Amino acid sequence: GKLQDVVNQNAQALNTLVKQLSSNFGAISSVLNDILSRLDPPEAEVQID
Amino acid sequence: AYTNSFTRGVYYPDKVFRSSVLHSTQDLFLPFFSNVTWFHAIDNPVLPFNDGVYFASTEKSNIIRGWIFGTTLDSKTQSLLIVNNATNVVIKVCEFQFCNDPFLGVMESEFRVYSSANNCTFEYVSKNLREFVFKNIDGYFKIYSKHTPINLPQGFSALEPLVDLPIGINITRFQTLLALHAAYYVGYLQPRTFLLKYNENGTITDAVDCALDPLSETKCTLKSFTV
Amino acid sequence: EKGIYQTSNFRVQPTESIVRFPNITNLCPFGEVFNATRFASVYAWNRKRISNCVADYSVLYNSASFSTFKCYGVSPTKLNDLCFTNVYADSFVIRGDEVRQIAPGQTGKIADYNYKLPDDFTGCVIAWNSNNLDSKVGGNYNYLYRLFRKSNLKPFERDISTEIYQAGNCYFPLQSYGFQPTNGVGYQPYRVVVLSFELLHAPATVCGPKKSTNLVKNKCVNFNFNGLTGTGVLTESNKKFLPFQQFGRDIADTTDAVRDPQTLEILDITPCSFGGVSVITPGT
Amino acid sequence: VRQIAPGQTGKIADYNYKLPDDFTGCVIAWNSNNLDSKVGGNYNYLYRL
Ligand SMILES: *[C@@H]1O[C@H](CO)[C@@H](O)[C@H](O)[C@H]1NC(C)=O
Numbered sequence: 001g002k003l004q005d006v007v008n009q010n011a012q013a014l015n016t017l018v019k020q021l022s023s024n025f026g027a028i029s030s031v032l033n034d035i036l037s038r039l040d041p042p043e044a045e046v047q048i049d
Numbered sequence: 050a051y052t053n054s055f056t057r058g059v060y061y062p063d064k065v066f067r068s069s070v071l072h073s074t075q076d077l078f079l080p081f082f083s084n085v086t087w088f089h090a091i092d093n094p095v096l097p098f099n100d101g102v103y104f105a106s107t108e109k110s111n112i113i114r115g116w117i118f119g120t121t122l123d124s125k126t127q128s129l130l131i132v133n134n135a136t137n138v139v140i141k142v143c144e145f146q147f148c149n150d151p152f153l154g155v156m157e158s159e160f161r162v163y164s165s166a167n168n169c170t171f172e173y174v175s176k177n178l179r180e181f182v183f184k185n186i187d188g189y190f191k192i193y194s195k196h197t198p199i200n201l202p203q204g205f206s207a208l209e210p211l212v213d214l215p216i217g218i219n220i221t222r223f224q225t226l227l228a229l230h231a232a233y234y235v236g237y238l239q240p241r242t243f244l245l246k247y248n249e250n251g252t253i254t255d256a257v258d259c260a261l262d263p264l265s266e267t268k269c270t271l272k273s274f275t276v
Numbered sequence: 277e278k279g280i281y282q283t284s285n286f287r288v289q290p291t292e293s294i295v296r297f298p299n300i301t302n303l304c305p306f307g308e309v310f311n312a313t314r315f316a317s318v319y320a321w322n323r324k325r326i327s328n329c330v331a332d333y334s335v336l337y338n339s340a341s342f343s344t345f346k347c348y349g350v351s352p353t354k355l356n357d358l359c360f361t362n363v364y365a366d367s368f369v370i371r372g373d374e375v376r377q378i379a380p381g382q383t384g385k386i387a388d389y390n391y392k393l394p395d396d397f398t399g400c401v402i403a404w405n406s407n408n409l410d411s412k413v414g415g416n417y418n419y420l421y422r423l424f425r426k427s428n429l430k431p432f433e434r435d436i437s438t439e440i441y442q443a444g445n446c447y448f449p450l451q452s453y454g455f456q457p458t459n460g461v462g463y464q465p466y467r468v469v470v471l472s473f474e475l476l477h478a479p480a481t482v483c484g485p486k487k488s489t490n491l492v493k494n495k496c497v498n499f500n501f502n503g504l505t506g507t508g509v510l511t512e513s514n515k516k517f518l519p520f521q522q523f524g525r526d527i528a529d530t531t532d533a534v535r536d537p538q539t540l541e542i543l544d545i546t547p548c549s550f551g552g553v554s555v556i557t558p559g560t
Numbered sequence: 561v562r563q564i565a566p567g568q569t570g571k572i573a574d575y576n577y578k579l580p581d582d583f584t585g586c587v588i589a590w591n592s593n594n595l596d597s598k599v600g601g602n603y604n605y606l607y608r609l
Pocket residue numbers: 051052084
């Protein structure tokens with residue numbers, strides 16, 4: 001278990017990290033290129049930020 | 050008459066392929082082991098369609114024909130008519146004077162489902178178990194279906210959308226059309242964050258309802274089917 | 277100092293741009309939205325679907341015949357290069373000072389009683405003058421709007437009820453438009469149209485005017501599928517899309533496969549080969 | 561006159577004068593009926609189409 005746990009923990013963290021790319025954080029969308037292709041820089045700047 | 054909806058009313062929540070990923074969707078489904086009202090046709094009252102309907106239908110002869118969705122089922126009110134003519138699928142949205150007992154005659158003899166219409170904004174034309182799901186969100190009607198062979202099995206089967214339609218009608222009551230010369234079950238849907246497990250082929254072949262029981266809630270929290 | 281240092285990033289650059297759009301030539305009719313002879317009353321605003329078409333929104337834009345043309349969730353010059361499932365064209369006529377009332381978070385008679393836009397509105401609101409066409413001497417009272425009713429409305433709901441409003445005291449909830457050509461701009465008619473775009477992953481049907489180009493595989497491309505932009509190498513794959521699915525998705529919610537809009541075939545999208553570049557140096 | 565600002569579009573902005581997004585100045589405008597509008601037409605003023 002002690003080794004296995006280690007692996008899982010690291011793997012688990014990575015998964016969480018990756019999943020965090022699917023969150024809006026308040027932006028209009030979680031996809032960068034979506035905003036890049038929908039708004040001009042003066043407004044897309046805020047979402048991207 | 051009532052019965053129990055074992056593993057039914059599960060539809061692809063999104064238009065998007067996913068493979069071997071345990072994806073959790075919050076959306077109004079038919080809750081597992083729900084308590085689905087059974088009707089026998091050996092009986093066509095006006096039921097509510099408040100938050101969707103799991104309209105299952107087992108029948109052997111395609112006598113179950115049509116669906117009627119009204120707010121008052123009178124000329125003035127708005128009535129959607131999904132009429133499946135066994136020659137060509139038909140849909141209309143038109144505001145109808147309805148005969149209380151609509152039906153088709155059949156070698157075809159009668160077509161007696163209505164009396165008149167005034168104005169409207171659409172028309173479209175084209176051993177077993179057949180499930181169907183009907184929803185309306187912000188005036189967008191969405192229909193899902195599934196035709197499976199069985200001579201309600203607690204066998205899981207995904208449901209895939211076929212038509213959207215922007216009825217914009219404020220629907221609260223509905224109906225069902227039968228053709229004289231056939232059991233059918235209405236459930237009601239509620240918002241239940243289902244966690245669904247697509248297989249390698251990207252087909253939804255198992256799911257857990259988050260609010261069924263402690264085991265299911267635990268499964269939901271861990272994003273897992275085994276605990 | 278002597279050691280191995282992770283300096284930079286190796287990222288293959290794309291060779292060419294692929295744009296793939298469904299090939300439809302039907303240019304959809306904005307004309308009878310904008311030279312529509314009559315719009316109905318603002319309470320009974322007119323809906324029309326817009327789909328299976330190609331829409332030059334730019335030619336609409338630079339027409340300069342519109343007083344207020346302002347856009348949310350999308351930008352007028354950007355939205356030429358986008359493909360949408362549906363375009364919802366809602367038009368009516370409202371008063372002058374109240375054109376600003378057509379926006380999310382906005383209140384008043386028409387907003388709280390005739391038309392609301394949702395907070396997450398993803399469309400474009402336009403309005404222009406109609407003195408020559410909507411204001412007749414002595415009065416044109418065809419236009420009507422709602423005054424009294426129990427509650428506040430949800431986005432894009434229609435209420436066409438004529439029930440006599442109950443104050444406690446009975447009044448007709450609808451009052452009409454007394455409209456002279458002689459009046460001030462504040463009391464001058466406005467022809468109003470709003471387009472709300474149904475952004476969905478369903479097969480897009482309204483698309484901007486853009487030449488869809490040829491498809492090339494197994495080479496770094498900068499691609500654009502129905503307005504979905506990206507970069508990568510497109511290969512044949514076996515992800516069995518069922519006929520209704522279009523965009524296969526990845527864990528991180530980045531599109532991983534796409535059904536090509538012209539030939540309904542699936543393409544796996546692999547990010548162009550990249551990595552870290554480390555530099556091995558004995559101490560300088 | 562509102563078109564004279566960063567992030568602003570239209571005939572004059574997209575065709576005659578743009579201000580940058582990071583504009584660090586001051587925009588002023590006033591009336592010129594008495595001085596810029598003559599009976600029958602003063603067509604001296606011109607712009608790009
Ligand atoms: C299900 O319906 C039956 C009627 O046969 C009733 O006894 C039972 O209380 C119902 N249960 C729920 C949860 O609605």
